[PDB]
Write a protein that binds this ligand. Structure first.
Ligand code: HEM
Ligand SMILES: CCOC(=O)CCCCCCn1ccnc1
Ligand SMILES: [Cl-]
Ligand SMILES: [Mg+2]
Ligand SMILES: [Mg+2]
Length: 430
């Protein structure tokens, strides 16, 4: 007989640690592990932090991908932070997922995220101004207009007061914003959404499991990027695609592959993780109603810490991979030049060596040095200011229009080692 709406999901006792998981039951290199309940996953990373803070795992092989060599998993905050801040040792080349890069993949996935400096920073500087706090602040009106309309439409479209948060708010809000920043016409936003979803959801049968489909999607978005870039070359617009085609690095314009890769990076990065932060945030407010109440009764005062706690809690990017350029030793584990190293942000963000009470979802948490946007340094998330603003506005519009919005079913969770995703989240309101 809990308070609230009759079909709301069960609440949880805030602060309860999950049971730790016997190490023999942990297989980071099997998709089956990524299908387990998030409580079991959290307890497994707790076991690793305790018993095997640096451990070795085989690489998963999604259909058509090349697994290649295995990887050393860094599950402690300090090691993820150290690796992030030493890119001369922990290189982002040749890939930031664990699979091997191939020439075929590099045509579409060869952006600055898989490069070291100086070339990485010369590419990043083409677009960095558009993502700075003061420039992102100027698009508050666009974020608010879109979020307000989406929440209003949830109400207008659903006489029964039941909706899917993902398709009706969390997905379409960041999609609109990044597509408008890129200069993509509204008629194509839903094609961009589907392409994003396949690129980042590959291996989940609800998204795609045929490598031919992954490659067709990659080629189609790459061709879309090229064609839009060609238009902007001839007639400039005040959009990021125009910035990309007009730029020079080391005195040369970007090639077609560089344009395609940069466009794909920005549009794919620019929507799915923010979508998932919003959905995980609504799930957390549903499980921890006292946190909802405290945010709703001081929205602007708590918003800066609340948004960061949602990102720490959700850790929308589970890991990033690096490749060693020289031998090292961490925690008595020798690792060799050329070895793959995986940085588990999801685990760093529960590390009791860094966080007081890591199992408490605390929207006032301060300080909150989470690694949800990475450990800092050269590749720190370009979109962090944009994501923070989108998350804040989405929750402010829910608070104002449907303050008792609550999840009514447990999420359908994306099957992924890389992205902590929710495919559907049914919600209701009064
Ligand atoms: C809550 C949402 C988001 C999370 C949790 C997130 C997380 C991350 C993480 C962990 C990295 C890697 C950092 C590193 O290697 O040190 C990253 C990089 C990146 N993110 Fe995000 N991101 C989010 C939203 C966005 C948005 C909205 C964009 C907009 C386009 C974006 C664009 C990028 C780009 C371009 C990079 C590569 C930066 C570089 O290589 O210099 N992200 N993000
Ligand atoms: C993996 C296949 O897609 C790519 O290579 C391009 C997008 C990479 C996104 C990396 C994850 N992310 C999302 C938001 N900030 C970071
Ligand atoms: Cl939760
Ligand atoms: Mg419906
Ligand atoms: Mg436009």
């Amino acid at each position: 007989h809990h308070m609230g709406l009759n079909t709301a999901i069960a609440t949880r006792v805030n602060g309860t640690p999950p049971p730790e998981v016997p190490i023999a039951d942990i297989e980071l290199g099997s998709l089956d592990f990524w299908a387990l309940d998030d409580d079991v996953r959290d307890g497994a990373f707790a076991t690793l932090r305790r018993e095997a803070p640096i451990s070795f795992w085989p690489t998963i092989e999604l259909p058509g991908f090349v697994a290649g060599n295995g990887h050393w998993a860094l599950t402690k905050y300090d090691d993820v932070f150290y690796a992030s801040r030493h890119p001369d040792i922990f290189s982002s080349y040749p890939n930031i997922t664990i699979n091997d890069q191939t020439p075929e993949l590099a045509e579409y996935f060869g952006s600055m995220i898989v490069l070291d400096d100086p070339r990485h920073q010369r590419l990043r500087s083409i677009v960095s101004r558009a993502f700075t706090p003061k420039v992102v602040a100027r698009i508050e009106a666009a974020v608010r207009d879109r979020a307000h309309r989406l929440v209003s439409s949830m109400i207008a479209n659903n006489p029964d007061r039941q909706a899917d948060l993902v398709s009706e708010l969390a997905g379409p809000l960041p999609l609109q914003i990044i597509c408008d920043m890129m200069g993509i016409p509204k008629a194509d936003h839903q094609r961009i959404f589907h392409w994003t979803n396949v690129i980042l959801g590959f291996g989940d049968p609800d998204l795609a499991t045929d490598f031919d489909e992954f490659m067709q999607v990659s080629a189609d978005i790459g061709a879309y990027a090229t064609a839009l870039a060609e238009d902007r070359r001839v007639n400039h617009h005040d959009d990021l695609t125009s910035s990309l085609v007009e730029a020079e690095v080391d005195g040369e314009r970007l090639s077609s592959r560089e344009i395609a890769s940069f466009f794909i990076l920005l549009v794919v990065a620019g929507n799915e993780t923010t979508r998932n932060a919003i959905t995980h945030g609504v799930l957390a407010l549903s499980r921890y109603p006292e946190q909802r109440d405290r945010w709703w009764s001081d929205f602007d005062g708590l918003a800066p810490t609340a948004v960061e706690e949602i990102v720490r809690w959700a850790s929308p990017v589970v890991y990033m991979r690096r490749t060693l350029t020289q031998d090292i030793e961490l925690r008595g584990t020798k690792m060799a030049a050329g070895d793959k190293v995986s940085l588990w942000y999801c685990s760093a963000n529960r590390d009791e060596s860094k966080f007081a009470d890591p199992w408490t979802f605390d929207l006032a948490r301060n300080p909150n040095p989470h690694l949800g946007f990475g450990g800092g340094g050269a590749h720190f998330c370009l979109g962090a200011n944009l994501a923070r603003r989108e998350i804040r506005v989405a929750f402010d519009e829910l608070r104002r229009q449907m303050p008792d919005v609550v999840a009514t079913e447990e999420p359908a969770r994306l099957l992924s080692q890389f992205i902590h995703g929710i495919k559907t989240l049914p919600v209701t309101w009064s």
